[PDB]
Design a protein around this ligand. Structure first.
Ligand SMILES: *S(=O)(=O)c1ccc(CCN)cc1
Ligand SMILES: [Ca+2]
Ligand SMILES: [Ca+2]
Ligand SMILES: [Ca+2]
Ligand SMILES: [Ca+2]
Length: 1358
């Protein structure tokens, strides 16, 4: 009666062992959170709805109204809840118009109780056939914000409705066990407090560098298990490939009686492109194929009658389409002994052995948590699974996502068991148990290629054995009462208590032993091989566990022997891990139960957080892990991946003013002849790290770039004077602190390095004063993410050199044209690095060339230097034939990037050719630190305030011209570096004097002007405006908050009594919002009428423009040549305003509506513009609504990610969105009543404080609505109490908040004197409860700062 079940999968998990026992799925409920279903499919069946946990609609909808749930409903007797959480209850489809549905394939594993054949002829079934499947659809996008709250209420829904276990497909690599996402952990811990198991896959990134190279032996912390599975409560799942693949597969009758290779049937693969099965699949062929090769002994890794000689894929034996196939050595590549090869190609499907069976699935996650805890927890198949696809179709897989549902089913079944067998067991202790049985009853997997046991860090506590878990009544724990043991740090001896637990009323007796493993290293490459070495099995004996009882035995081991060999191979520590194995002394193969352990010989706390500086590695002739030594010697292109400093380049020109800049480059590097950036060296053979904070945009600042090996936090940049050897008086600290992840590079979407421009240093002290030239330390410090760790530093030697090298004189011999300059002398500590002579080769009548990039709409201007060879004695044979002498320039170059350039115009009248001459050289200040066109004349009727002024380009991307302007009204700056109203400065009258001129910007709150938040540096005269220019920043150099500040000018030089100015400057940087206006047609031409602009406030409009751009040279922009240099500009043609209030948009000579622009500028200088074609896609009947977040922070350090749902006046989601002015946050809707709901945002960075539902009506009169969700920012800090001596037992450490509440603190595993927590920014008192007279002493208070780490040095007293 057609029952044929595939058990390729149930066989070696022992599924039937718990089925026949009456534990099928029935009665329990598994909540699958994933991307969709097709819940009518054959498989979502349950027989005997009368034994289920939920009867029908009446039952379900009634539980919904007792919990407080208004959405979603039952469908089947199997699919009992649904809710498409992407936009608050849609259908769960994921259809086409492959046909794969990842989300149901998942469920297919857990409960696919089908009754019909797949393409083999088998009836596939899930681990729990008869459990009921509430489904929450939830799946994250990048445009979104933080998907978390979606999940968090899917979890909360499952729990209140009453599920028993949730299969959560959600992964964030390198998770931590204790400091995960706080609202998500507690949401889970609430499921665990009910009868809920939370089963989460563990990831597919596998280990640090998995897409580059195996990890170096010096960096043992290569694990990537992800959050939330890294949670203590949930059960993380790794994956082992299945032994049996179901696949479309190629056949050959010529080897049909071989049975070595499935009787001819061999497995093929098709690469990144060009799956040519639409090219002759199902019909026999000849040798006329693309048989790749063997490729190895056992890899399986990826005439002539199609003679296309395909190396478009080969590319190294000793994507362009010919024919795609990958076959392994035996499979045919040896079976090549007639060459005739009749080759059918799968008109059907087949069942075959997996080329990687029983192997551990390359991608499965691994390693410790980020805070050093042992996860995953259990392995299950995943691998090449077969399961429930779109509609009546069947699986495929390879993915940890497929393993975790296995455990779901298992957790279901085991729970049944426990309910039956231990019904005095409360829902408080249910789920940890169903786990602890699942883990302790499992077969330690054993790596087939090595015949060693696979590391616990890769398999948890072994492969899933469900029978063993329901037929034993035995589980195992360590001290933490957890199914594994995370020992933390490890000395010469490892000692620890294991404890075996017995549920049955039949006491048992068991012999045990301990296998101890470590990490195999390839000794020729010094990299881990990701395979273990058995070191020694230690046996310990046997003991007896009472019936309904426990017993506590003590493993102990001495590992002194291995320490010299291991510690040699693995200098920075190494893992010592393994299994305690437990069998019945009588009848060996009964009561097989095991517990995995791991510990670290060294200090896992203090492993290096960042890969060493590229400069230091090259000084040791070592190299970076992701570095690419391809190119000239010492070629550190800033694009490459490493740890160093970056800075910004700007060439020096002698015919015009530079217009542009080279962009970023690695500090200490300089461009050689061929344009390769090279790490040039000083006379002692070192490179030099020197910046030149002069305002010329050549190496003005220095910023840290790192390749991090572990998750970091607390990272900041400080600058000390190098005399300050202990680093105890910082001269400057980066104003932000920084946290972030390993650069693990699982694939191209994961960065191999991260540049932190927030660490940029500019030779300014903490007070804005300039730090004098000298020798300094730029210390980048940080912390790994394990409580107690020591704070790692990384010091860079850095020179401030702001002085050009010397140009005194040179000796010229006219007989040979010999130019000997002198010995090279630099001013300052940078040192000279290059000597040069060039002349200006005129081309097209100009000494420079003007390149116009028409794709970036960018213009760059370049001196036409040509060089004069340097001879080894340091002199220059000038080609007098190719340009005059004295139109040769001599150029000497700093290391920090100052540049001296003399023209030979420091000359004597004719003299041409007599005899050797001594020749004076003077620097022409060709490198100048560009300043702003003044052209202003001040008069007593003026405020004396001046600011700067500039337009905003619409097409070209050069920096638009700007000039100083007066400011006698409208005291508002937008500090946005656009050249328009970016600062307040003070200019004085020409015939007046201003002695001891000092500007101080005081805060709002400072009634007495006691403590400036910004001050002018010493030497600030009313003529140097820059010295009084306030770019709306603090002394330390971060942006002030939008608002009002007092700007106070004080000069003494009224030749006696002095005065004080005091203007109220207001800071605001908000792009004004352009609404759509009307478009009417008068006479035969288009007439555009903008809506009326209001002028109240800082964002009130004071310029209104309609214009269009004429095509001049096929360009809409244009270069204009002056002595002032070249300037770049749009081809703006303005349109006068009619009295109508309209502007007249004439359709001129091939000028289009997309080249007319509306543009506005508010009282603070912010500027916005739209195109008239955009502003017209609004119908005349239609309105526009724009949603946005109101953050009280500068409009560059603000979220821009969130999502919303607009509902029509009936509550239906609006459909068929049309966006306005190219903003995904602006919709065009017909007139009516609407309601918007803030769905997701980065709940990490911000907290919503206004209503999350807003109503609005769009109407003829209100045809533009802004709705704004108001928010508040979130700052976290880390706090760590570090004690003198370990605390006496029964002590309790806590952080006491200023409201008065207590945050409890746990002792840190890897540092046992340290108790710490990540906390919300504020003020805390460390509070300790000591059981005796004990009295902890010394400075328990702290006021944290954002992203900082705070240590407290407390002492236990007697
Ligand atoms: S599953 O949804 O966790 C999964 C498995 C494998 C991949 C690609 C890695 N080769 C993605 C997702
Ligand atoms: Ca400079
Ligand atoms: Ca110092
Ligand atoms: Ca210098
Ligand atoms: Ca501005």
């Amino acid at each position: 009666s057609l029952p044929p079940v595939n058990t390729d999968i149930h066989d070696w998990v022992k599924t039937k062992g718990a089925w026949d026992k009456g534990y099928k799925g029935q009665g329990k409920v598994v909540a699958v959170i994933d991307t969709g279903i097709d819940p009518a499919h054959q498989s979502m069946r349950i027989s005997d709805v009368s034994t289920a946990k939920v009867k029908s609609k009446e039952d379900m909808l009634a539980r919904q109204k007792a919990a407080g749930i208004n959405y979603g409903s039952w469908i089947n007797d199997k699919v009992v809840f649904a809710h498409n959480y992407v936009e608050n209850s849609d259908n769960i489809k994921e259809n086409q118009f492959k046909y794969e549905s990842h989300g149901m394939h998942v469920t297919g594993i857990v409960a696919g109780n089908s009754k019909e054949a797949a393409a083999t002829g088998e009836r596939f079934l899930g681990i729990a056939p008869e459990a009921q499947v509430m489904f929450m659809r939830v799946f994250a996008n990048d445009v979104m914000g933080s998907a978390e709250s979606l999940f968090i209420k899917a979890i909360e829904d499952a729990v209140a409705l009453g599920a028993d276990v949730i299969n959560l497909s959600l992964g964030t690599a390198n998770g931590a066990q204790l400091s995960g996402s706080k609202p998500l952990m507690e949401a889970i811990e609430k499921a665990k407090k009910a009868g809920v198991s939370v089963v989460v896959a563990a990831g597919n990134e596998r280990v640090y560098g998995s897409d580059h190279d195996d990890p170096l032996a010096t960096n043992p912390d290569y694990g990537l298990v992800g959050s939330p599975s890294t949670g203590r409560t949930p059960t993380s799942v790794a994956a082992i490939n299945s032994k049996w693949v179901i696949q479309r597969l190629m056949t050959v009758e010529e080897l049909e009686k071989r049975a070595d290779l499935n009787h001819g049937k061999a497995i093929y693969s098709e690469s990144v492109d060009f799956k040519n099965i639409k090219d002759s699949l199902g019909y026999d062929k000849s040798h006329q194929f693309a048989y790749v090769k063997e490729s190895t002994d056992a890899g399986y890794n990826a005439p002539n009658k199609t003679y296309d000689e395909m190396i478009a894929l080969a590319k190294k034996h000793g994507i362009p389409s010919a024919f795609i196939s990958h076959e392994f050595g035996k499979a045919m590549s040896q079976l090549n002994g007639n060459g005739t090869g009749s080759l059918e190609f799968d008109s059907v499907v087949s069942k075959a052995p997996s080329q990687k069976g029983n192997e551990m699935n390359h991608f499965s996650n691994w390693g410790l948590t980020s805070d050093g805890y042992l996860k995953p927890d259990i392995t299950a198949p995943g691998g090449d699974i077969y399961s429930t696809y779109n509609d009546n179709h069947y699986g495929s897989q390879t993915g940890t996502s497929m393993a975790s549902p296995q455990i779901a089913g298992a957790s279901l079944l085991v729970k049944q068991y426990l309910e039956k067998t231990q019904p005095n067991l409360p829902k408080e202790k249910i789920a940890d148990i169903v786990k602890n049985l699942l883990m302790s009853n499992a077969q330690i997997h054993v790596n087939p290629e090595t015949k060693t046991t696979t590391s616990p860090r890769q398999q948890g506590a072994g492969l899933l054995n469900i029978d063993g878990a329901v037929t034993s009544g035995l589980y195992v724990t360590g001290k933490d009462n957890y199914g594994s043991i995370s020992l933390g740090n490890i000395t010469d001896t490892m000692t620890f208590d294991v404890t075996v637990h017995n549920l049955s009323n039949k006491d048992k007796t068991l012999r045990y032993d301990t296998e101890l493993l470590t990490d195999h290293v390839d000794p020729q490459k010094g990299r881990f091989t990701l395979t273990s070495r058995s070191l020694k099995t230690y046996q310990g004996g046997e003991v007896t566990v009472p019936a309904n009882g426990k017993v506590t035995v003590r493993v102990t081991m001495d590992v002194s022997q291995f320490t010299k060999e291991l510690t040699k191979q693995m200098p920075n520590g190494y893992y010592l891990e393994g299994f305690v194995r437990f069998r019945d002394s009588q009848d060996d193969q009964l009561n097989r139960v095991n517990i995995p352990f791991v510990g670290f010989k060294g200090q896992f706390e203090n492993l290096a957080v960042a890969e060493e500086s590229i400069y230091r590695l090259k000084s040791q002739g070592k190299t970076g892990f992701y570095f690419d030594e391809s190119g000239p010697k010492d070629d550190i292109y800033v694009g490459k991946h490493f740890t160093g400093l970056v800075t910004l380049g700007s060439e020096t020109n002698v015919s015009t003013k530079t217009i542009s800049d080279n962009g970023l480059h690695t500090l200490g590097t300089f461009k050689n002849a061929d344009g390769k950036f090279i790490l040039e060296k000083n006379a002692q053979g070192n490179p030099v790290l020197a910046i030149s904070p002069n305002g010329d945009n050549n190496q003005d600042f220095a910023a840290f770039k790192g390749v991090f090996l572990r998750k970091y936090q607390g990272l900041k940049a400080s600058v000390y004077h190098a005399s300050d050897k202990e680093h105890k008086n910082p001269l400057w600290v980066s104003p932000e602190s920084f946290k972030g992840d390993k650069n693990f590079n699982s694939d191209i979407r994961f960065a191999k390095s991260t540049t932190l421009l927030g660490t940029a240093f500019s030779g300014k002290s903490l007070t804005g004063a300039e730090l004098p030239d000298g020798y300094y330390h730029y210390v980048v410090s940080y912390y790994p993410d394990v409580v107690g760790a020591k704070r790692q530093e990384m010091t860079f030697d850095m020179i401030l050199d702001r002085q050009k090298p010397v140009l005194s004189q040179a000796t010229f011999d006219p007989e040979t044209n010999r130019f000997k300059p002198e010995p090279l002398k630099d001013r300052g500590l940078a040192g000279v690095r290059k000597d040069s002579v060039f002349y200006l080769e005129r081309k097209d009548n100009k000494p420079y060339t003007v390149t116009i990039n028409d794709s970036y709409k960018y213009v760059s201007v370049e001196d036409n230097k040509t060089f004069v060879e340097r001879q080894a004695d340091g002199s220059f044979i000038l080609p007098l034939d190719k340009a005059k002498l004295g139109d040769f320039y001599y150029m000497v170059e700093d290391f920090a990037g100052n540049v001296a350039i003399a023209k030979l115009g420091d000359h004597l009248p004719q003299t041409l050719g007599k005899t050797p001459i001594k020749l004076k050289l003077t620097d022409g200040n060709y490198q100048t630190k560009e300043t702003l066109k003044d052209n202003l004349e001040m008069t007593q009727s003026d405020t004396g305030l001046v600011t700067n002024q500039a337009q905003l380009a619409v097409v070209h991307r050069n920096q638009p011209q700007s000039q100083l302007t007066k400011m006698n009204q409208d005291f508002f700056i937008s500090p946005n570096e656009d050249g328009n109203k970016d600062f307040v400065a003070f200019k004085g009258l020409e015939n007046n004097v201003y002695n001891d001129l000092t500007v101080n910007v005081y805060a709002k709150d400072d009634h007495q002007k006691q403590t400036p938040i910004w001050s002018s540096q010493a030497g600030a005269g009313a003529s140097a405006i820059e010295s009084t220019a306030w770019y709306g920043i603090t002394a330390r150099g971060s942006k002030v908050m939008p608002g009002d500040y007092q700007y106070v000018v004080t000069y003494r030089d009224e030749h006696g009594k002095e005065h004080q100015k005091q203007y109220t400057i207001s800071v605001n940087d908000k792009k004004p919002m352009i609404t759509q206006g009307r478009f009417d047609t008068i006479n035969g031409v288009d007439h555009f009428t903008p809506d009326k602009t209001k002028a109240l406030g800082s964002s009130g409009i004071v310029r209104e423009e309609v214009f269009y751009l004429a095509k001049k040279n096929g360009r809409k922009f244009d270069v204009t040549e002056g002595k002032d240099g070249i300037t770049v500009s749009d081809n703006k043609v303005y349109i006068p305003k009619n009295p109508d209030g309209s502007y007249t948009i004439s359709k001129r000579d091939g000028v289009t509506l997309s080249d007319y622009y509306y543009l506005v500028e508010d009282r603070a200088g912010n500027v916005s513009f739209a195109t008239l074609r955009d502003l017209k896609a609004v119908g005349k009947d239609k309105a526009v609504v724009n949603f946005g977040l109101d953050l009280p922070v500068p409009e560059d350090k603000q979220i821009v990610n969130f999502t919303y749902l607009v509902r029509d006046a009936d509550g239906k989601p609006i459909e068929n969105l049309e966006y306005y002015n190219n903003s995904g946050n602006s919709l065009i809707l017909p007139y009516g009543k609407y309601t918007v709901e803030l769905l997701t945002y980065d709940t990490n960075a911000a907290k919503l404080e206004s209503d999350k539902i807003v109503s609005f009506t769009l109407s003829a009169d209100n045809n533009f609505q802004q709705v704004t969700f108001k928010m508040t920012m979130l700052a976290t800090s880390q706090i760590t109490a570090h004690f003198d001596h370990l605390l006496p037992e029964g002590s309790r450490v806590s952080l006491k908040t200023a409201q008065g509440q207590l945050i409890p603190l746990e002792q840190s595993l890897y540092v046992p004197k340290a108790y710490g927590k990540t906390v919300q920014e504020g003020t805390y008192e460390v509070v300790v409860s000591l059981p005796k007279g004990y009295r902890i002493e010394g400075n328990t208070k702290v006021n944290t700062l954002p992203n900082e780490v705070h240590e407290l040095s407390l002492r236990l007293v007697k």
